[PDB]
């Protein structure tokens, strides 16, 4: 029925402000629950949020359970999710598994905590933040763009890690016994030097461990430069990959839009051409002009579909060539 289809459209694959409002509202409520989880352990407003995180929690649990059982009821629309095995393979999806896990765990914690309820509920309140992005439209993009450039990322991480290991060992060798101004020794072990290396290479630079001897500072400077410049590489690669992948998806969407127009145009043109043969005459007086009307409509829609270029001004690489070829064909 149309009801199941409209519900499935409203719950999965949302589009329009009518669904944007609902999703933004549920996300804002999840974030407000999380902010209530932050203030529940500050030890200065603990009594203000140690009790409301039970009523709010059970309200959210009932809401999400209803949402889950309703989105389950919409599995009849999908061609592969029909039947009991179809509902089972729908529940086999990872996001639905996460939703079910959150639901049952919240229910169990609410049941046991009232028979320290916050002690376990915080990690669930974290996991509720993940069910906000439906259809997994975020992780697939990242997975694809990381898998495409799977060789540049590996080599840059390998070079960075090798530099980290070697340079941090040399620093530890040069500072194995040296006392700071506060009276303690910083590079006590080799793991402490590794910690210094991981803090320097990523350019965090806390300031708990700083080399002291003049032979330590030279290696620290060389490592900082020549390995910050190598650990900072994944930013550009992943960025260009993201942009290119989104452009490819947009082009594929536009081209999938173009097809129905062409189909309607071909079909309507053939219907208009075969005006010879499909009181049976007065009806035939208007079928011709109606076919002409829908043919004009189809030509309009097709011209409106092939008109856009999607970045729009991308024809500058073949501007003069195309007009030259066209005028050559004219002759």
């Amino acid at each position: 029925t149309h009801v199941q289809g409209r519900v499935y459209n409203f719950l999965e694959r949302p589009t329009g402000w009518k669904c944007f409002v609902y999703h933004f509202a549920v996300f804002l409520i999840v974030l407000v629950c999380l902010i209530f989880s932050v203030l529940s352990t500050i030890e200065q407003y603990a009594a203000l949020a140690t009790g409301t995180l039970f009523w709010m929690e059970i309200v959210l649990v009932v809401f999400f359970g209803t949402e889950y059982v309703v989105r389950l009821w919409s599995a009849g629309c999908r061609s592969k999710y029909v039947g009991l095995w179809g509902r089972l393979r729908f529940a086999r999806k990872p996001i639905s598994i996460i939703d079910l896990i959150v639901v049952v765990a919240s229910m169990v914690v609410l049941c046991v905590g009232s028979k320290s309820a916050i002690r376990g509920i915080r990690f669930l309140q974290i996991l509720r933040m993940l069910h906000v992005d439906r259809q997994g439209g975020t992780w697939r993009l990242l997975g694809s763009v990381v898998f495409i450039h799977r060789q540049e990322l590996i080599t840059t991480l390998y070079i960075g890690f090798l530099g980290l290991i070697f340079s941090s060992y040399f620093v530890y060798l040069a500072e194995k016994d040296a006392v700071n101004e506060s009276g303690r020794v910083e590079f006590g072990s080799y793991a402490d030097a590794l910690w210094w290396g991981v803090v320097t290479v990523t350019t965090i630079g806390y300031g708990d461990k700083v080399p002291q001897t003049w032979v330590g500072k030279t290696i620290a400077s060389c490592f900082s430069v020549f390995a910050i410049s190598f650990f900072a590489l994944p930013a550009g690669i992943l960025g260009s990959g993201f942009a290119l992948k989104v452009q490819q998806k947009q082009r594929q969407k536009h081209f999938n839009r173009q097809i129905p127009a062409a189909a309607s145009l071909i079909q309507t043109a053939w219907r208009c051409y075969a005006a010879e043969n499909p009181l049976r005459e007065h009806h035939r007086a208007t079928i011709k002009v109606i076919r002409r009307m829908q043919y004009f409509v189809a030509k309009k829609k097709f011209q409106q579909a092939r008109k856009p270029y999607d970045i729009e001004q991308y024809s500058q690489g073949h501007l003069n060539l195309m007009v030259r070829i066209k005028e050559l064909q004219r002759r």
């Binding site: 051409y273 004009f296 030509k299």
Partner: protein, 144 residues
């Protein structure tokens, strides 16, 4: 020539259910429902939007006779139609197979009659091979 224009004007008045030279979009939808082709939407709205040069919704044949006057075989339409076939053809392929043509013709847009699909396949493809050039198809379509 003029007799056809007068007969078409009379038919438009009959579809408008009145002797006035009005498009009568609602009367046009009623006549379409009477023709079995129930529009089920406001398709007549966009139709008139394209058929009413002035966009009046109902005018004394503003471009109806002019709509007829569109040759429908002019190069400005054969080019568009040939571009429409290009969507289904690989690089310099043409010759789109009768199977693929029937598939896209019946399973996309609005489905046509299956016998009409077979008739179109027979008309375009005469050699019988799995190669029906789009150029010959558009040539016969805009021929007459």
């Amino acid at each position: 020539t003029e007799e056809q224009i007068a007969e078409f004007k009379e038919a438009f008045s009959l579809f408008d259910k009145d002797g006035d030279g009005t498009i009568t979009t609602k009367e046009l939808g009623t006549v379409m429902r009477s023709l079995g082709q129930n529009p089920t939407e406001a398709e007549l709205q966009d139709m008139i939007n394209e058929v009413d040069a002035d966009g009046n919704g109902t005018i004394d044949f503003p471009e109806f006779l002019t709509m007829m006057a569109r040759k429908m075989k002019d190069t400005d339409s054969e080019e568009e139609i040939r571009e429409a076939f290009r969507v289904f053809d690989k690089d310099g392929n043409g010759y789109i197979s009768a199977a693929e043509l029937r598939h896209v013709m019946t399973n996309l847009g609005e489905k046509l009659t299956d016998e009409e699909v077979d008739e179109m396949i027979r008309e375009a493809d005469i050699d019988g091979d799995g190669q029906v050039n789009y150029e010959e198809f558009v040539q016969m379509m805009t021929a007459k």
